[model samples]
Target: TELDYDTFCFYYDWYGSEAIDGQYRHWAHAIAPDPNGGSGQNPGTIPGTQESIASNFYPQLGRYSSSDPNILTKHMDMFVMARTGVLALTWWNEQDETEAKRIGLILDAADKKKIKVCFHLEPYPSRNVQNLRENIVKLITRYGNHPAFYRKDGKPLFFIYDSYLIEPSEWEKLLSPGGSITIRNTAYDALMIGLWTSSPTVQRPFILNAHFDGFYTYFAATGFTYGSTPTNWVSMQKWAKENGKIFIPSVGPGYIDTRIRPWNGSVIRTRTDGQYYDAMYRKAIEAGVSAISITSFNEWHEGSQIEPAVPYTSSEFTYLDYENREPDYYLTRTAYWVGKFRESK
Candidate 1:
């Protein structure tokens, strides 16, 4: 199999239900805390609902709905126009089976437009070795043949978000050659990459012991976390190379999910007029890794989406805008650097 695209990839969230599950998900703008003040803390008694969130992060799409065919099409168009090739869509549990079928739509659209697709396996409940094995098995069985399903070094690749939730011993059973449910030499085998959030939470040893092929830090507020910081890119790459594993450092336009993560707001990374995104690309290039990935295509709950933010004002609060720039500013710029990335090779 071949790697998709020339330069970058994106993390696409597919967890949008019309209803708010656990105070999150969906594109509704939750009435702001200090509707009259700043993005400081707590939502006050602002109130929340399924159709909306009572928080800061808002999309240009304006309380848009995912799982909508038109929305997905627009997303793929931006990726195609930007030349950002791969999309790692968020995939939860068996319940997402219907949602997962969207892959057929996404794959069909993306493949037609020449965009690639992969799954970001969210750490769903009871995602044990047996269940996970079953999950990927089902995934591959159904969609492995799709031309758009991402692959690296002749193997299918998946980004396992919050992968550390499952015990390494158990993961070993799913990935290691010697485990009971070993994927090695099996039809279910894949180049599964794990999440590396911080120093010890999902460490080097866990990745190695769990038989993960690689790791990534998806948080766009790099400074807020050790793993996400750009300064650690080279070192992380070095460590990965030293340990004989893959290092995929994620870069993004910016991050601000205070709406969903109300209590946390200390660390916010501004896009800095696209400079931050360029700097992250530089970091990844300097890291000397085989591939680079983007923080997201649309994870608006975290306000880390680079899908394109339009200017908007709500009764509760006003959200930022592209002001003085085209709606496709990020997309246009992404194409610019992607050319450079390919040239660098």
Candidate 2:
């Protein structure tokens, strides 16, 4: 099948707030009652040691105020409602219990409005197969029927963030009926699994089963050093076509995380120029992608944020500035290309 441009959607992060006004106010900063805002106590205030570094001491709690216009207003006003069919919000089961509850509330609200939700399961590679299956079952039973859950051909959609970490047999066992125990009452309509650094040749066998709707190339830059560019998309699409499966392409503007880990320094693959990213999306569409997923809405520390944040913070952090705050050449150019792509199919 050719790519489906009508299905383009932006992925949003559920936690954290952008720098409001002139000060940086994170979810941990205001949501918590503590002055430290749940950021763990600095260990002896060492100049640059691990213990001295800032941490969100308490896990995220309570559903973010969905009624607060600030939460979803910007994205809807700026882009989502205009071009995207759905919003793919990231929620992980491993996050702080309170935070999870808040996210659940937000999703519940979205469900009332008929918005689609896809849960990104944080992979637990170390857990035994039975435990992993049980956890998945619990999550499905809890949220499977939520109006927000994504569905295709009737069954709900579930995505695993790390595909390489889990064993193939374990996955197969979970998907098969009468194996130990059934994780889901009905088999999933589609399961989107991640690919760490494997080449197209290496990713085939693991995805051959009928249980999965498709495989998503994952952690192109965040998890490992591999970069998911137009070339990567071309290869992956060719493989998907040959194997009779669907391929979803993922693109990131760039990535860099110096705030939390300065020793590792910043790692940026995509450039600040919008032309490069625009061209990459064009190629993925040409290569026959059924869906396209952006790297993130707001990964501030990683420098991959698409949401507006403080300006002049870094020379490389100007992309969001152009899109969110000041409208200029890049934003216009981006709108042009996005319109073109959507009109193409």
Candidate 3:
């Protein structure tokens, strides 16, 4: 009964502070120069210092270390508040020491709170089919036994971001049953989900041919891609059902990245006092998706996080709040939607 409701939220473990990494990590996100030379809004990374940071919002806990036990507990509590069952944590390759170390810590905290943890595998540099098999073997060998390691039907769950970067043929080597490095029916077998960025007509082959168990749209901005548009989810889900594939629809409260990508204002979606979130949830439920994912829990750079935020003003910019609502407003709203989603079932 506890795991009956299937909802997940993305969590980033890349944040760092002076007390942890001696220097701020992702809080000081790098800014890209304007493609339009000096004409466009290339505010640069000037505003992303330790205290100021690069988010349109300021976190309620301040710029904290992801590795901090207290912060982990607080995050778990927030998940509890949202009634979020699974956390899809962003993970790089095996060599990234920071992510490697924090993976166990997060799983430990998640287990304590009865929360499940899954991997949103990031596209690390030089990623290829051979190393993918290695990563799967390594990941399962190490963490598969953890109580918090999320699984569905006796297999672990993995969401591979930007999976299209690898060719379908390459993926076939790892995912297809008869391929050389296929993990099917192996000890490392898992429910591998791929990102659908293009039209389902164009992207369906990528997931089907590659033998991915399912597909998910990871972006928060609607209409940014065909896969991200909620209007198209019904058709997509219908196709998935016909083809016997899982379709997980991801929703976000809002989208803003002006702090990091100043020129990205064109795609920013106003929260409208949480109406945007409600609309997205309604669409996902209407589409009859079996599972729904929140775009983020604390992706400050993207500003899609449902984590608590506060109104804080600096000399340069005033961080966005929940329209003066309680700091934990989104978490409670998420719980409301979760209840509705369960009832809709």
Candidate 4:
């Protein structure tokens, strides 16, 4: 079983963007100093400001860098300090070689400060397998020994965002390249593949490998939809328990992508209000899930963020008016559920 709440992990992203008064300002079109030039203007936000806001702040275009001391403190206040560990996205298309180097710098700082950190890899199956494997190998070899690297038992842990695309044989080959593996930890212990597909094709291979620690079925439940039902969660609980594999059950408030995507279609809604999320948390705890992963901390664009965007009116609070962007009942309710789940068991 996963260690108590201490073993639970929270994932966060720290992409480069503008900072103001030590706080990472997320407002669009707000000018700030460009990091590349002495007095040049950086595209402080995403394109099409009017369209983006009209789209309900969908398609987020910026991030607050943790490199700033004030932003980092605010981050910890809002979410990190309340959690046990953090999984930081280190590599993605947004950052090329720069990503690898930047992640190393942040990881170095985190190590010195005793902050648990894990590198999230976004390797697409469509990409060149050889290059992806080589890059991941280099990263693991370089930082696997860091105290912040995630571990189950005692071995280092790494996670791949998309596991369903790559074939099991291909994964095996990459892990045991040329039948001579020089890595300190075995491939399975070091890597975790995130399962996103609903088709059951990937489950067979996942169960077959001793190295495959386990899988996290993504978007299990959210504010907009529920991929797996309570029964499905129970089945997974049994399967994982009997097989001696780690299981991470995820829950979320809701999702709405009105920013970038067209909103001509009918609006879809679900338990987005605070009360629903609170009840959902208790349900997950009752389901006997030792480990739980929240859908997100600040996915403001998707309308799934638990963070307060605006203050709530008392009238809206009584009726659960989720569209209200205020921070009153919703914030307190979220904290209650989070604390409740953390202290449970």
Candidate 5:
């Protein structure tokens, strides 16, 4: 079972440029991910609606092009040294053919690193049971044969970011065994894990009754809500175990998004020189979770990335740094924790 050595991280491969990505779109901020010297052109607003990008990053490699194979290769190396087993790529939808094609590049690099790949299903508009079924089938038929794809007990696992978007009645049509259009026990059947958030309206029983195989708390900020809080994992894990469901509790070094949403700094999490991550990892073990998922490998916007970030010192907005340590601090620490997690279990 992947549960034994699965230290998976979320990888956001959605930011780049026209030359690198075949389009003029740069999702994070106006500047190319070239970290040489980049800042959010419009720090407080989102792209498309606000006419400016609303994310910030301080990578040691400078803001980088995701389409660049070197960037992809560096990412794989980071994970390999950290002892992480898998990566969950953010898949917006099949329509974005750019990333669909890009997955091959990532998979090829990952295979050489002897790692695994899985999909983090983003909730795109017009997403429904029927479309989702086709999407999963597309996912399986096209890339499932790859040696780098992640599977648990012969079934690939998908993490739904906003599983709360579709109501349980609607999800049952795809997840339930007896429901119409159900994929349960079918060749396309997968271990679908839903988003179990802290919202009162979106709780564990909600997805459980909906027939999802399990749930995960994707947020890393401690005070975000009841779900992201570490203490809650013990109880949540208990609930999952009592009911025979999977519980993947996401952990992160920290969180900071003043660049994207300057209006909202209410949910910033600090890395505390890795102390915060230590606590979260310890909590996951305390809960006896079947598996653990790192909130991100490179979700730079929210600054939850464990990827190496330069010691960015600036007058306007400064990103979190290793605090006098080398950029590899977080990466090395991740390797330490993986060993520790294995030992503790």
Candidate 6:
């Protein structure tokens, strides 16, 4: 009924377990070829076990199912404690009933905690303007009326991941006011937020040409790409303000995907005992971003999650913790910055 202050986090529902989905879903990620030194096409896949999963940090809840009701309740409670007002759940497609049910559970839990839920549209197969239009229609027709569905300025909000993959012209046909098949003012109309990943020269067109309502820097690893770099936020915020668009900068505690992509160790951004999060948050606040999105709540494979993780060890590999900090250290730090952000507003 009312608007949130706009502190959001990306929440993944891909995790599974035998008690739920009959098998592990994403825990057993495959090890990819690292371009740094490895010379193989494929190395191997990690066993999707509690101890030998594919992540640098072990979750405090262990390898749990996304559909687990208890887990969802716990996650919502934690989100409330962290002052995370919104949770952007990843949506693959309309046919994925399992994911849909998981989202339902999440929405119910989040609603209980007064946390709004939004959708992060993943780049599914055969993604195009026509299918995108149909998907939005389905999404709204199904979940738009839900109590926990997130809306801003009387319209739903969608974060389109890898939005650049679709040509700008195609996007205009759906997003623009006068395009051939626009959803501009219809029931499915939403705050379509595209991803900004490169220099201004390339990123500018994606905004101006695509007719996106806003743009977001989705990556957590600063300097891994031009848009993810916090130093560029000031200029980005200025340009967005001038152009009448929303610019949400995503921040994460740290990044380390060595288990999934071992060759990518050079770009790993260490947490630095929470100072790294502080640095990124300070920049976003200074840039005067309209809203902030945490890179993840539980994206273990990428190791950019802010979800609680504890010191874990096994015969295979020693898991990374919060540098001796408490499991919920990032959550507390996020709330602290959130207070500062509110003060600035």
TM-score of each: 0.85, 0.69, 0.95, 0.68, 0.88, 0.96
Q: Show where candidate 4 strays beyond 4 Å.
A: 1-67, 88-90, 93-97, 108-114, 124-129, 145-147, 174-188, 199-211, 220-231, 263-271, 311-339, 342-345
Pull out the clashing pairs in model 5.
33-63, 33-64, 34-63, 35-62, 35-63, 54-260
Report lDDT (Cα) of residue 231, candidate 4: 39
lDDT for each candidate structure: 0.71, 0.49, 0.88, 0.49, 0.79, 0.89
Query: Considering every candidate listed, which one attains the maximal TM-score?
Result: 6
In Å, residue 279's CA in model 4 sits off its true spot by 3.4
Error of 1 at 56 (Å): 3.5
- The alpha-carbon deviation from the true structure for residue 149 of candidate 6, after best TM-score superposition, in angstroms, is 0.2
Off by over 4 Å in 5: 1-5, 22-57, 94-96, 199-202, 314-316
lDDT of 2 at 266: 34
Instruction: List model 4 lDDT by residue over 1-345, tens digit each.
Output: 112233333344443344432433232333334345466544344332223221232222224454554545454444444343454443554436555565655565555445556655666445445666566667667777777666656655555666656666656655543423323255533645454335334464454442455555445243222223443566666666776666666665654543323331233335445555665556666767666665555545445555444422232111123454445344455455556666764
Candidate 5: worst-modelled 10 consecutive residues by lDDT:
42-51
Task: Please provide, for model 3 over 169-279, each residue's C-alpha lDDT reduced to its tens digit, 9 standing for 90 to 100.
Answer: 999989999988889988888999999999767798888899999999999988889989999999999999999999998999999998778877888999989999999
In angstroms, the error of model 3 at 184 is: 0.4
| lDDT (10s digit) by residue, model 5, range 198-313 | 75355866876689998888998986867898888888888888888899989898887766556457788767778888998889878877788998788877888888877654
Candidate 2, 6-98: lDDT as tens digits: 343445454432232222223222121334334784423212121221221111211233334456544444343334434555544454675
Distance from true position, residue 56, model 2, in Å?
18
> Which candidate has the highest lDDT of all?
6
Q: What C-alpha lDDT, on a 0 to 100 scale, does residue 208 get in candidate 2?
A: 62
Better of 3 and 5 by TM-score: 3
Clashes by residue pair, model 3: none
| lDDT (Cα, 0-100) at 159 in candidate 1 | 86
